[PDB]
């Protein structure tokens, strides 16, 4: 086509989606990770995670307001990944890299899994 | 912070949101523009438009499944803008620039209004 493109549009959209998350506006699901709860937008979770995409395209699960993750999932690892989903920034640290990679594998977040594997390989 | 960033994340998120729109997955509102109807995600509309942000943060309007736009709004201009919201690409043409700018002013999409004013100024 003969379209023009606004370079910053996708980033500005994500920034606004994160502002809605921060103010709890139009969040439509709670993700339960053991004793912790995380409110989010189903569409954003689906756009970032193969696992949430599969869950919310399911004809029954699409209507659930609460999703319980596997008890092996670490709440901090999930929190770091949820922040990444809404900002493109990943808080990857020596103390959290194992929990973050395990959570990203479960959530099916391929690019996060890739950078975790590379950062681990560099330290061995 | 000491975060790393995935350059393409925001773009990939928007691409996935557009895939959900194309398959009518988790769309939660119909925008009526005269005889035409457009299905969309309230969060995406809010992230792109000052008008939709104001509408869906209203304690009553936030719960509406149908929003009727002003009858002066052109369905094609709205369609072009809805596509822009979900892709960052704007199909700006000599034949549609006036309808697109008028729709972007109503929807409060400042960057679109700016490029329309510049393209019009170049042709005068």
């Amino acid at each position: 086509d003969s379209c023009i493109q606004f370079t910053r549009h996708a980033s500005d959209v994500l920034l606004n989606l994160n502002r809605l998350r921060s103010r709890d506006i139009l969040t439509d699901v709670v993700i339960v990770v053991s004793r912790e709860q995380f409110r989010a937008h189903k569409t954003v979770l689906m756009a970032c995670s193969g696992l949430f995409y599969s869950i919310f395209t399911d004809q029954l699960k699409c209507n659930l307001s609460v999703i319980n993750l596997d008890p092996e999932i670490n709440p901090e690892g999930f929190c770091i990944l949820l922040d990444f989903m809404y900002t493109s920034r990943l808080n990857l640290r020596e103390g959290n890299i194992m929990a973050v990679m395990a959570t990203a594998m479960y959530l099916q977040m391929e690019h996060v899994v890739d950078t975790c594997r590379k950062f681990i390989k560099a330290s061995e | 912070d000491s975060c790393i960033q995935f350059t393409r994340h925001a773009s990939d998120v928007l691409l996935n949101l557009n895939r959900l729109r194309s398959r009518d997955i988790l769309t939660d509102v119909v925008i009526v523009v005269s005889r035409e109807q457009f299905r969309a995600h309230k969060t995406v509309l809010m992230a792109c438009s000052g008008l939709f942000y104001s509408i869906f943060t209203d304690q009553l309007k936030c719960n509406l499944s149908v929003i009727n736009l002003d009858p002066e709004i052109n369905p094609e201009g709205f369609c072009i803008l809805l596509d822009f919201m979900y892709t960052s690409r704007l199909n700006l043409r000599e034949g549609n620039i006036m309808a697109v700018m008028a729709t972007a002013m109503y929807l409060q999409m400042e960057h679109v209004v700016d490029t329309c004013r510049k393209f019009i100024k170049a042709s005068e």
Partner: peptide, 4 residues
């Protein structure tokens, strides 16, 4: 704005 750019030509994509």
């Amino acid at each position: 704005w750019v030509i994509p």
